[PDB]
């Protein structure tokens, strides 16, 4: 459990005093070696008018009312150049602070110590982990969380699962909106959740059948995880109906993939004849007598048997989404596409997953930014909607 260097322990109820448009916040806590006086805001309109969260079941469904009073976003006092996201509840707290390059993150402890009833924060710095037309600038992405993710990273409760999913997606969107794909004003072509699908229970299947939510694994039940390619293909097959009207459909799951991989999505392409990527291009398959849309994705949040930190999960999610956005794995031959550790470390889209080695580990390489620009320039006119929020 104790792998990274700085993992100082915090208690929410004692140290986070939480002193007080719409509702403001001036919460503070003595975490690490900083007084951490914050300023945060939330409102109703930050959530989409079509932002429907469905917690599916076996033939049953329900809608969860997202608490717009909770998800905060603001700045640290005295540092107007900072950007901090947060989500404060009675016990659930997921905060992420960006200032002076170094990044400070918060997680509940129950995800790591294998005891879900513990309440505590995990404050750490990501730098010390041991290892141009607007109005079409938003890709409505569909979030799918299968039963493993809900059971292991949500305590069996829907609220924690959706809160974590929204926080991670907001992190990814904040990463995306900053980057300029052409080294010019063409920036802000990020993502936005359209509908979160939370699978609370495994889907019973007939013997010999397949499902991306079943309680087993396709290649062999001896392992505790699917094959990455087969799992992604099956997820694309099963979600084909719900993925038609959404720009992307990303699956969040919890199993230990083989050989250290964590996620893999279909690579995008600006070509009309190519299926798979940003736009929901049609592709028929006689196996299921239905159209198959290859605008899928995959993100597992468990490697080597231990739940990974939110920073590495965010990095894997944006790596998969960059694969979806037409990018390709960085070529290890050139230091300009991917440098060595000393000169800023590996960029995003690296063949292997790197969590927090250096600062530009969250930044897309131009060597991989060109492909994303090529795909976006041709797919934005087709399957990019409005921002609809702030």
């Amino acid at each position, epitope marked *: 459990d104790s792998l990274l260097s700085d993992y100082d322990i915090l208690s929410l109820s004692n140290i986070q005093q939480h002193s007080v448009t719409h509702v403001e916040t001036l919460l503070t806590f003595s975490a690490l070696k900083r007084h951490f006086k914050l300023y945060l805001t939330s409102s109703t309109e930050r959530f989409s008018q079509n932002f429907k969260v469905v917690v599916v079941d076996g033939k049953n469904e329900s809608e969860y009312t997202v608490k717009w009073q909770d998800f905060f976003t603001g700045h640290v006092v005295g540092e107007p150049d900072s950007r901090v996201l947060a989500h404060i509840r009675d016990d659930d707290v997921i905060i992420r602070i960006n200032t002076d390059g170094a990044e400070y993150n918060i997680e509940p402890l129950w995800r790591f110590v294998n005891d879900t009833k513990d309440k505590r924060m995990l404050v750490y710095k990501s730098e010390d982990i041991k290892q141009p037309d607007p109005m079409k600038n938003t890709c409505k992405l569909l979030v799918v969380a299968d039963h493993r993710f809900y059971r292991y990273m949500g305590r069996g409760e829907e609220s924690t699962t959706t809160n974590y999913l929204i926080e991670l997606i907001d992190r990814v969107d904040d990463i995306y909106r900053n980057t300029s794909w052409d080294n010019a004003g063409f920036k802000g072509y990020g993502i936005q959740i359209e509908q979160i699908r939370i699978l609370k229970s495994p889907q019973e299947v007939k013997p010999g059948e*397949k499902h991306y939510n079943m309680a087993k694994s*396709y290649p062999n039940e001896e392992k505790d995880a699917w094959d990455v390619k*087969m799992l992604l293909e099956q997820f694309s097959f099963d979600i084909a109906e719900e993925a038609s009207k959404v720009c992307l459909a990303h699956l969040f799951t919890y199993q230990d993939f083989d050989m250290g991989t964590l996620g893999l999505a279909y690579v995008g392409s600006p070509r009309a004849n190519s299926h798979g990527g940003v736009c929901p291009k049609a*592709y*028929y398959s006689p*196996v299921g007598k239905k159209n198959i849309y290859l605008n899928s994705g995959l993100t597992s949040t468990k490697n080597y048997g231990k739940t990974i930190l939110t920073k590495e999960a965010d990095l894997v999610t944006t790596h998969e989404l960059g694969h979806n956005f037409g990018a390709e794995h960085d070529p290890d031959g050139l230091a300009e596409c991917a440098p060595n550790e000393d000169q800023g470390g590996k960029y995003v889209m690296y063949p292997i997953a790197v969590s927090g080695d250096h600062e530009n580990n969250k930044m897309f390489s131009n060597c991989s930014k060109q492909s994303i620009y090529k795909t976006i320039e041709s797919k934005a006119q087709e399957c990019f909607q409005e921002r609809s929020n702030k």
Partner: antibody, heavy 119, light 108 residues
Framework: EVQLLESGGGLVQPGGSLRLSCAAS????????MNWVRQAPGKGLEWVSY????????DYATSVKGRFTISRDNSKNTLYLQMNSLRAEDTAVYYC????????????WGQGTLVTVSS | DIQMTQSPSSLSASVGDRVTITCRSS??????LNWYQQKPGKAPKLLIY???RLQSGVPSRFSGSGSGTDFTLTISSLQPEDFATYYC?????????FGGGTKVEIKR
């Protein structure tokens, strides 16, 4: 220049096994689903097998349900069709067809291996 | 299981004559039916897909029409290089099977 070379195929006794392969080249193998199609000598030609682009969804005709096996090593850029317990009726030319990644048709075919069976 | 039928099984026509091939299914295939042409000694080549569209690579004389149950393939002019057997295929269900096979040769 999409070319689908095929190997294997020869005189085998009933109850044998073959591992004829499709050396697909000139196109992205990992994205294109493929089909295996047979042709009896001097007769019509019927579809045999289908495989998903990653190998997830694979199903066969009704006549080869429990005797055939199709796999892909996308790393080696090759499509395989392993058939066991071959029967006298399986005497046919076996074509390897690339399913159209659009629609549900097939664009390009192989050249076929004359799989003849007899004792 | 979808059963596919072709008629006529073997037809004769001149060079300028308009050949029509009828391919009737045992169900109502929505739009997924495609034809192939195979000259004796060569791998089959696809001409028409989706029962109403022509492939990029086949001359525009080949025309396809018919929806639901009745499917038709029509070639306006029988150019001397189009004298080969034709198979019609459905691509709707898992056991996708092809037609029996129609053959066209020189009328003399």
């Amino acid at each position: 220049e999409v070319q689908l070379l095929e190997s294997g195929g020869g005189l085998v006794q009933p109850g044998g096994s073959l591992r004829l392969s499709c050396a697909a080249s000139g196109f992205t193998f990992s994205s294109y689903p493929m089909n295996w199609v047979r042709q009896a000598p001097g007769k019509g030609l019927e579809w045999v097998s289908y495989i998903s682009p990653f190998g997830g969804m694979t199903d066969y005709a009704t006549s080869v349900k429990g005797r055939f096996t199709i796999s892909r090593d996308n790393s080696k850029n090759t499509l395989y069709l392993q058939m066991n317990s071959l029967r006298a009726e399986d005497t046919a030319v076996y074509y390897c067809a690339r399913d159209a990644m659009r629609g549900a048709e097939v664009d390009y075919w192989g050249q076929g291996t004359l799989v003849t069976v007899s004792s | 299981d979808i059963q596919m039928t072709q008629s006529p099984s073997s037809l004769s026509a001149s060079v300028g004559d308009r050949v029509t091939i009828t391919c009737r299914s045992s169900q109502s295939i929505p739009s997924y039916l495609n034809w192939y042409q195979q000259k004796p000694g060569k791998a089959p080549k696809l001409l028409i897909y989706a029962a109403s569209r022509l492939q990029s690579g086949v001359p525009s004389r080949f025309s396809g029409s018919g929806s639901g149950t009745d499917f038709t393939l029509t070639i306006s002019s029988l150019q001397p290089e189009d004298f080969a057997t034709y198979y019609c295929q459905q691509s709707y269900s898992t056991p996708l099977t092809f037609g029996g096979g129609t053959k066209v040769e020189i009328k003399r």
